[PDB]
Design a protein around this ligand. Sequence first.
Ligand SMILES: Nc1ncnc2c1ncn2[C@@H]1O[C@H](COP(=O)(O)OP(=O)(O)OP(=O)(O)O)[C@@H](O)[C@H]1O
Ligand SMILES: Nc1ncnc2c1ncn2[C@@H]1O[C@H](COP(=O)(O)OP(=O)(O)OP(=O)(O)O)[C@@H](O)[C@H]1O
Ligand SMILES: Nc1ncnc2c1ncn2[C@@H]1O[C@H](COP(=O)(O)OP(=O)(O)OP(=O)(O)O)[C@@H](O)[C@H]1O
Ligand SMILES: Nc1ncnc2c1ncn2[C@@H]1O[C@H](COP(=O)(O)OP(=O)(O)OP(=O)(O)O)[C@@H](O)[C@H]1O
Ligand SMILES: Nc1ncnc2c1ncn2[C@@H]1O[C@H](COP(=O)(O)OP(=O)(O)OP(=O)(O)O)[C@@H](O)[C@H]1O
Lengths: 277, 277, 277, 277, 277, 277
Amino acid sequence: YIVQAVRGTMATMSLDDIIGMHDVKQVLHEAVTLPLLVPEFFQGLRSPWKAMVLAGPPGTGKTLIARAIASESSSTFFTVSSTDLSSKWRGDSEKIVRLLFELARFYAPSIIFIDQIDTHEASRRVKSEFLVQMDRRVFVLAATNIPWELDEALRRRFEKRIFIPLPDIDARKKLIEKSMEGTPKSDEINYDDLAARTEGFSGADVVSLCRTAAINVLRRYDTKSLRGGELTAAMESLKAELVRNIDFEAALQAVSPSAGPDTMLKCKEWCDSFGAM
Amino acid sequence: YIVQAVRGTMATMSLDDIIGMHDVKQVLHEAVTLPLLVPEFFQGLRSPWKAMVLAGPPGTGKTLIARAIASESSSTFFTVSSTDLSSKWRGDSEKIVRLLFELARFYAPSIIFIDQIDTHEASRRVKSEFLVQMDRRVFVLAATNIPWELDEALRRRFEKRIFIPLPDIDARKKLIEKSMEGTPKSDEINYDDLAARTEGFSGADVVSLCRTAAINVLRRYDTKSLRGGELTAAMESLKAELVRNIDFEAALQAVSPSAGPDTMLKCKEWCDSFGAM
Amino acid sequence: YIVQAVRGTMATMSLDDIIGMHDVKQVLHEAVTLPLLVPEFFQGLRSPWKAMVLAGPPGTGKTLIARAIASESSSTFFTVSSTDLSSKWRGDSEKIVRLLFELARFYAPSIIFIDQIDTHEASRRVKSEFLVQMDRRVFVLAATNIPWELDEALRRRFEKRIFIPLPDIDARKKLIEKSMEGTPKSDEINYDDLAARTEGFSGADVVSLCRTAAINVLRRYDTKSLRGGELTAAMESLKAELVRNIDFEAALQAVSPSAGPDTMLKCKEWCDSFGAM
Amino acid sequence: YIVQAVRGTMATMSLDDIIGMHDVKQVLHEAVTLPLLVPEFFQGLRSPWKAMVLAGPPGTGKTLIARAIASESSSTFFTVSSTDLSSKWRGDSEKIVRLLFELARFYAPSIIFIDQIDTHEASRRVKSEFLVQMDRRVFVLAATNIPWELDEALRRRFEKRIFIPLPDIDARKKLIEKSMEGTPKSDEINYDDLAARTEGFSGADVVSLCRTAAINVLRRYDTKSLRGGELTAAMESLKAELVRNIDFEAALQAVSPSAGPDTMLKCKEWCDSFGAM
Amino acid sequence: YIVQAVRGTMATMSLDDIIGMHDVKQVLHEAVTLPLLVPEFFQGLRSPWKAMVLAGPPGTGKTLIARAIASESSSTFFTVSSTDLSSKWRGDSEKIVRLLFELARFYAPSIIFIDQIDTHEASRRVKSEFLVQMDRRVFVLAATNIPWELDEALRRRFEKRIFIPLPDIDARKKLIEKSMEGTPKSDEINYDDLAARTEGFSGADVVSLCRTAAINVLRRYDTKSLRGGELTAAMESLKAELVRNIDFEAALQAVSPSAGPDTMLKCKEWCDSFGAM
Amino acid sequence: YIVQAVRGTMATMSLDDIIGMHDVKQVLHEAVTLPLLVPEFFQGLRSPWKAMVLAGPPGTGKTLIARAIASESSSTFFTVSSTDLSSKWRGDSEKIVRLLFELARFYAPSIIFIDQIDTHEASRRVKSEFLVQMDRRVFVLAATNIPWELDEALRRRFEKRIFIPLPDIDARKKLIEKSMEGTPKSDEINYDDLAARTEGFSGADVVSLCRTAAINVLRRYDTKSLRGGELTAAMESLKAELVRNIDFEAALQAVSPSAGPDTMLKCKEWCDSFGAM
Ligand SMILES: Nc1ncnc2c1ncn2[C@@H]1O[C@H](COP(=O)(O)OP(=O)(O)OP(=O)(O)O)[C@@H](O)[C@H]1O
Ligand SMILES: Nc1ncnc2c1ncn2[C@@H]1O[C@H](COP(=O)(O)OP(=O)(O)OP(=O)(O)O)[C@@H](O)[C@H]1O
Ligand SMILES: Nc1ncnc2c1ncn2[C@@H]1O[C@H](COP(=O)(O)OP(=O)(O)OP(=O)(O)O)[C@@H](O)[C@H]1O
Ligand SMILES: Nc1ncnc2c1ncn2[C@@H]1O[C@H](COP(=O)(O)OP(=O)(O)OP(=O)(O)O)[C@@H](O)[C@H]1O
Ligand SMILES: Nc1ncnc2c1ncn2[C@@H]1O[C@H](COP(=O)(O)OP(=O)(O)OP(=O)(O)O)[C@@H](O)[C@H]1O
């Protein structure tokens, strides 16, 4: 009908690129890979969940893991907006979802994920609209970062509600090192040492840090002096040239955690209290 | 027309699945079935309650019963959407509800049920339009959990406004014992003491917590059997386990059931005063 | 064409089924019939009434008086919707709100009544359109429940603004005893003390209350006669057992008013202040 | 055609029936008739005002003078709708608003007036269409009570912005006495006490007030004579009786004018604030 | 065929009766006639201005200017509206336009102008159909007073977008004297003290002001004290009578500008910013 | 069908011709030279980027740098806009999108340069196809001028999104001297003091400035006092007359951009933050 925006969300790296949450990845592999192999278990009592609840700080791989599983997804995924923004003239944007579940059955093994459901009156209209259609073999999920704003029933509805804590300095060592895979770099780098200053970072913080040094190294030497737009040998030796703490040092001063840690403490106190598995 | 879109409203289990509510259960057993069976006395002042009110937290088997009635019902249901869409082409679907009730007399015995229908302009427009459509014999009902949002005249118009608290240890006894049916389950278990440890939960809590033990089967098994394709021990034996007190024991600390029921307490204060039977 | 929708809008008991409204029943008996029995006096300077104002709580005999006058009147009623639908092909039914009056002319004296006329642009458009078509002998009236929401010119335009007091003890008395018609009962019943019990209520309260004792005619019995098919001796003795004060004990403990007195009391403040008679 | 529907826009009591507004009635007497009697003075810069701007609390003799002048009107008025359908079939009902003035001049030096035409796309399409259509001798007019409805061009288009406040007291004297016309009445009246105690009201208030004591003439007499058809000596002597101050005591206490001067006062500023003479 | 509607769009006084916009008056002697007299200058860079844009506070002689223009313009004018009211029978209008620029070059380098061109898909239909037909050398222009609805593409293609504020007191003074033409008038006059009260007043206000003292002349006589409707010789003394500062005094105190300034201020800001010259 | 028409999309110029954004000259030495010469530095994280688009004014050499890169590029180029105005005869310019990728891989290292990016439903058939395909170092680029032209996430999809500054000065002098070609004018002209105070301007602005002084040719002389309908040899020597520096004086100071530079600052911050390089 008006499926421009509906057909728009028609949709088409590796899995354990991400490192952490043995319980989560476990329960998901279990929840997803197995019933294809073993439908006979997953039945009524035994049958799997098609979603849960989640939350975490932004830039913490919740959108990247979506690509990790879309990459895993030998099944089908359906893409997402937080904005089914009709007009006062159009006024109806959850019959959209009444066609969505037709897509879900159409691509019968079907996958969906959003962030920040917490996205007035028509809010209650469509937000309420999703609930009856919420309940053939399908998965979906969603997440936020302010489950303190857990509004109505999703402490009831959903079997698990994960707040993620940031990786520890040990992890962050292993995760820089997972981020530094295949990098020109001097051997002065003790990742345990530099990670002393990373405390408070997310994944992406460390990402754009290692990048910030990756282009520090570009901008160290006569980098303004082009060859007039041509190749010099040393310019190719940039790949040959290494990254260093001093090439991080600009990245060290440059990058900051720059976030509300007390928010994580708040929604972590939440994640124990009405915060499901 | 949207007439076939009105034909989108076209419809086409057991009772002891449900536990509790024996007053309501006989009230509805009676008020629904027996008018079929004694038209000679279900009449006049003895008219069938064509609707009444409802309340309580959701995920309380209201949708579950709402399906159980359907597979139970010897009448003509009609599929229901609160998303009677809002085009700037007709801008009127409570008219199409005039066509609905037309179907209701066409399918002279019939059933409908929606929920959370506390659902500016369009609200009073199409709602009050329906109220014009409000008043052979037919039954419909609806529900919500916000009698806080007891909008204008709904509470006054219905026979009984039914709040439900959480179940008790004996309700929870039979509810556990219903979830556990046909299950590989050990016999060392005091499901009544387990139910004693169910302080202030839902039915669905019992459901997905029995499931939490159901996965705890795997968690006790060699859950690292991620050989994949290679069937092995895991494929050979998922029926082997019998669930045990320890499965549920971990399942308990796994729980963060839901938020506080202080709003359920609130409308429970409403369910007495201004809340009918 | 869509005028045929008004051809669908064509329309084609006793006052002693009702209690009170002495002023109103007077003024309507009078203002309608007696000019129709005395065209000669009640005309010109003695112009008979064609409309006035109304409002109050619902379930207050507005529907009851509606269908009551329907089966009563010796004149030409026409059915009443709020569905002058809104096509974005024509989007103009106020012409049919003129052919309205053509029907008032073709049926020279006519009867119409709506309620809850809260019924953007198009609202004001067709509204003022009716203010044009508004202004031989005809009477029509309307009502709402929000004279607080008496929109712009309605209060000014009508003679009689109406406030419906809730019933008093003797109102309650005859309202019961009329509600207790066709009612094999016990004679312990003290309708006076019962009327004492039942303050803060309306007529529909007595309706559903008498019905509550009505189902209690069963539920006094061994209520679970689920033999089924077996014509239980109750099924012959249905009307046999009597109404008893126990049945209204169980009922009236089951009853809530579902009444917010402060709103009807609010427009009761209005019913003197900008509230005509 | 719809052009033939314009044939439905076709038209075919006096001033001193009305009281007050010596200023207005002067300007109208003058601006209408004296050009029609003196083409020689009234021309060029002495051109007659073919329309201007009007206000007042509605139902205060605006449509009433609109009729009374039509009885006076010794020229060619034709009837006036705000109802040209929003047909998505012919592109513009404003086409007939173009043939409008062809009908005017082809017919005669002509007369037009509407009320409450404060009156989306098609709205301003046809509106501006008339704004061109307006710009020999012809007269037109229009009114409202919407002070904010000087939408785009309206303040500029109409020369003088006319408003009528609520009456003063000697007004209420002469307006009683005009409302006391054709009235057998007791000479005990203190019209000064009447206009005094009846202050701040509309004309229509007084209309229904005289009708109120009028019906009161019965409501003292044997209203209870519900024989029906059986004549009463009053039923012949209905007009025989005179009305009394005691009757208008009832007619006082029974009513609230059902209007606040809030927006009446707002336009009582707008009549000065961007309100021409 | 129906294109004769454009044969009906055909059309066939002084020019310089205006005080203001002297730079524009230059521009419109200059892009206009001297092309018709010296194309040798006007071609290439020198070529005449193809078109531009206009707006301002309504009724400031802007809709009246074009009568002066075409009354003076020896070149050819054809009328304009927004009257492309097509039919679904036609399913199209802008074949008109293809025949319309052909109409232009068919007769001669011609004259065209609309007001309120701020005027579903049909807008895109006739607009996209137009804007190539937009482009032997000819001039056209348009105007509005709603630059809030101003375009980008026509803000793009157009050379200029002209605003006028209200006049100034000396222009206003010589516009009294322009409005005091053919006018019996006294010698106690102070045209700049007259113009002192022009706060908020534009030209048309002064037009109706001279007409307001003009009517004031009779308003000093007694009108409804008829001469039997006779042409009283005092009515020729009106031709003898002169108008006076006192005669305007009443109009000045009695009259508002009937307008709002800050919208003219709004587009006076847009005329500088994103409004071309 | 459109294969030979597509053979016109084929394409192939000094690059410091376009001046400023030398950081971007590094970007394009790193997007043209090095992804063709040395993608070994540009590996993994440093890997070549996919494509982007551009905010900025026009008159900014978007196609200048495009063709300059093109004939400079060891990669190929294509002549592309959004003006694939498809037909029923063509049927699918989305097959022309697929053919665009096909030619891109055919001339495997290639460049494509497009704007009119937001230039009906066909926009979304093609846009969706292109969005799906985009996934080698076959670099591509688009552009626009609307900063809010981020469609839904296609801005979010891109490598980067850049706003660009105003131009340098010696080409403002030189291109003054390009548009002033073949013009009568003085030799005193300080084209770098012309180009000095050009702050915030573009090309056609200054073309209209050339026309502006070219009419100042007259508007020093008197347009009102003609030669009496004659064409005095001065009136034709205006063609012979010299335009000069101070002939632009009012054309310099009074002429404004009429554009928003602080939204340019907004989206400039958007390419500083939340917009990549
Ligand atoms: N555990 C991890 N292992 C490796 N990389 C990680 C991990 N967590 C985060 N990252 C890196 O940080 C980036 C953050 O991506 P992503 O946007 O998915 O986080 P996010 O929380 O979903 O952000 P947002 O919630 O704002 O969308 C990832 O692309 C990834 O490269
Ligand atoms: N008394 C009960 N008997 C059986 N099952 C129950 C009971 N209470 C809750 N449940 C279980 O809880 C789950 C959710 O119940 P259900 O959705 O029907 O309640 P609800 O009020 O309709 O919730 P919602 O309206 O939010 O969907 C069901 O799977 C149901 O089996
Ligand atoms: N004066 C009365 N006499 C008899 N019955 C009454 C009276 N007033 C109220 N009732 C009872 O109240 C019940 C509901 O009244 P009714 O529906 O007519 O009021 P209402 O304003 O039309 O309500 P709604 O508009 O919400 O349907 C009826 O069954 C009627 O018997
Ligand atoms: N001075 C007066 N003389 C006579 N009648 C008056 C006077 N002032 C007010 N009225 C009364 O006002 C009443 C209604 O006025 P009218 O209907 O003309 O106004 P309206 O605003 O056009 O009404 P509506 O808003 O319903 O269209 C008339 O019955 C009339 O008698
Ligand atoms: N400077 C002026 N010189 C001459 N006449 C003027 C001047 N200013 C205003 N007027 C008068 O104002 C009247 C209304 O102006 P006009 O309708 O032409 O302008 P407009 O703003 O286009 O009006 P609209 O946009 O509402 O059609 C004209 O009759 C004109 O005589």
